[PDB]
């Protein structure tokens, strides 16, 4: 983001006055003379300029990886991030690496209270009992019961701490202070 | 400000403990001192020997079930000479009448330096987690295989630990920002004034008599004023940081039906019951305030940078 | 009239943990202003952290729930420590100490109730600013 604004003001005023008076009288010989001349000029000048530039930059990067032995997995991690040179041997090693230590990708879900063994001592009553528990558990504590953050910050819950992830252009906790900040300009004459 | 520590509200002597043989002169902390003044780390609590007056009839029986151990725990069903190390190196296996039947035939290497020590005593007001507050070596029955890890090796999962995952998760994040501010102002003012005046008068008279007079006068003036003003300011701000976490392993301690160590059990056995805040605050620092139900072995690094102009 | 003023502020912080001490801090020296990320050090860091790991994410649980059941006086001691753990976190903390100045985040490190002052401000108690302020005297010099 970038912003620029320019303003230039120039003002000039000139005004002058001119006056010429001459009187001559004659009247035995009598001579009377008079001469009055007035001159006055006035000039005024004013100048103003405005020059304000503002620019903002935001950049965010994130990545994640999992699976395979720790040697081959993170060798792929270091070379993928800004490496720009994809290797042929590391991906083949990654193929054999993930064969030893895999991890979940897609997971189909099923409730536990359906897994309780049948024809037990009190299987059925405990089954519906845990059914009430699993329904209450997901509805007991969650983001739904916590408080809403500010500026549309996505609220999370990590072991009691009900923090909210604030957007990129905004500052941290509670999303209170903006940190855009705002430009302040004072054209006052300096005291000293 | 040399703020002192108002840290001596004393309480009344409570009743003596017959079995524990201790008194409970109580206390409380009120003021720390926010500035460079007198530091006061005086711990809360006080003990005293006292002659017991109650007969102390209550005692801890040896679980009335099976063979008592040398420290206070009990065999559930198969803690006999079957290679189950619970009490000592040869405390439980001291008497071996039958053949030393191995509990597991397959070769499973013991959990070396891994999440085996799954107990942690992190203090919410203190710092990083503490050591294990409970015994994490005892196992109940048939070995539970842990066929996972980087290499081809079999580890053991103790009966105290409910789960032990070997997921080698890895992630990282980076951010950057740039702020720019600029302002400039120019001003120019000029003033100019000019003044000129003339005055001429002549007189002559001749009606012998003669007369002649001539007056002359001039005037010159100008005043030039000049003003100039300039202002400029620039501001720049940069904020960028990065963080990375290389996850190694994850565990979940079993919440209930878990075994404890002989040191912690002896502390709970030799523990008051009349709300001894002094010893409880002392016992609180020994094993932390709250333990970890689930942890994440590994390591993380972070980098933070700031700039202002 | 000619008056120029310029201010600059820079701050840096970093941390690391886990792995053997040799490979861990070899990563530390090369990451800080190194600008040349190596291939072998991160692979060594992978095998390094396998030997000595450390906590990353920690799920919490109170201790008074861990007390063994059917003991001598387990129940009464359970609620007794429950009153203790509740009083402990509420006995001494930043909440009971005094507030610092200029929004300085107050910490507590073994009695010393110091407050972390912002970057543009000076140290303890956040009293003196250290921006400072420019002073100008156009008076004629005496000698
Ligand atoms: C406001 O003034 C700045 C002065 O830096 C202008 O940026 C250019 O600066 C150079 C060197 O100082 C001058 O030679 C150029 O003439 C300036 N550009 C222009 C268009 O005059 C800046 O462009 C001005 N305007 C704004 C909106 O910032
Ligand atoms: C006198 O008169 C002349 C002509 O009008 C004019 O230019 C001048 O400014 C006047 N004042 C003087 C010479 O002081
Ligand atoms: C005003 O007086 C100054 C003083 O020398 C001179 O430099 C300038 O030219 C004068 N301006 C006019 C318009 O007479």
Residue numbers in the entry:
A (entry chain R): 344 to 535
B (entry chain S): 18 to 224, 242 to 343
C (entry chain S): 393 to 535
Publication excerpt:
Despite a contiguous extracellular β-barrel, there remains a gap within the transmembrane pore where the shorter hairpins of C6, C7, and C8 abut those of C9. In the open conformation, the first and terminal C9 are latterly shifted by ~20 Å, while the ring of the closed conformation remains planar. Using a masked refinement strategy coupled with signal subtraction, we improved the resolution of the asymmetric regions for each conformation to 4.7 Å and 5.9 Å.
Previous electron cryo-microscopy (cryoEM) reconstructions of the complex revealed that the final MAC is comprised of 6 polypeptide chains (C5b, C6, C7, C8α, C8β, and C8γ) together with 18 C9 monomers that are arranged in a split-washer configuration.
